[PDB]
Design a protein around this ligand. Structure first.
Ligand SMILES: [K+]
Ligand SMILES: [K+]
Ligand SMILES: [Mn+2]
Ligand SMILES: [Mn+2]
Ligand SMILES: [Mn+2]
Ligand SMILES: [Mn+2]
Length: 135
RNA sequence: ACAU
DNA sequence: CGATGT
């Protein structure tokens, strides 16, 4: 219905899919960039969307914030709920880094608790999520 | 189909 | 047009 402005919005950006992946989190109200991950040479859109949510969970937990997280990724929201990122990306030498980060994100989810609501950003009604890369 |  | 996912 309405945008919860008191929230964190996250998104992936990429050069190719699979390709170079990065992500960031922004204050939904102001657009202030709160975190940005250094580009990862090969990953998928969904792996990056997943890492962005998990990073958001960790960022908010560390700061004792109860804000929700918005993501525009149906897939990544489900992977976080399941604590399991069901990516199809080949596990090989060139994908080792993204897969390490994904495995470590799952590991964090499996060893920590959170109440953070993870909400679908309704692009069809609200436009692009505020963390979008404009590309 | 829906979401990226 | 191609891709990643449920
Ligand atoms: K989108
Ligand atoms: K498809
Ligand atoms: Mn997105
Ligand atoms: Mn794993
Ligand atoms: Mn985007
Ligand atoms: Mn885009």
């Amino acid at each position: 219905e309405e945008i919860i402005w008191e929230s964190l919005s996250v998104d992936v950006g990429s050069q190719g899919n699979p390709g170079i992946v990065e992500y960031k989190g922004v204050d939904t109200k102001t657009g202030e960039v709160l975190f940005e991950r250094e580009p990862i040479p090969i990953g998928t859109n969904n792996m990056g969307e997943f890492l962005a949510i998990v990073h958001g969970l960790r960022y908010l937990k560390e700061r004792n914030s109860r804000k929700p997280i918005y993501s525009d990724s149906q897939t990544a929201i489900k992977w976080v709920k399941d604590k399991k990122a069901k990516s199809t990306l080949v596990r090989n030498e060139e994908t080792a880094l993204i897969w390490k980060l994904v495995d470590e994100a799952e590991e964090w989810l499996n060893t920590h608790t959170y109440e953070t609501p993870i909400l679908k950003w309704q692009t069809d009604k609200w436009g692009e999520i505020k963390a979008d890369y404009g590309r």
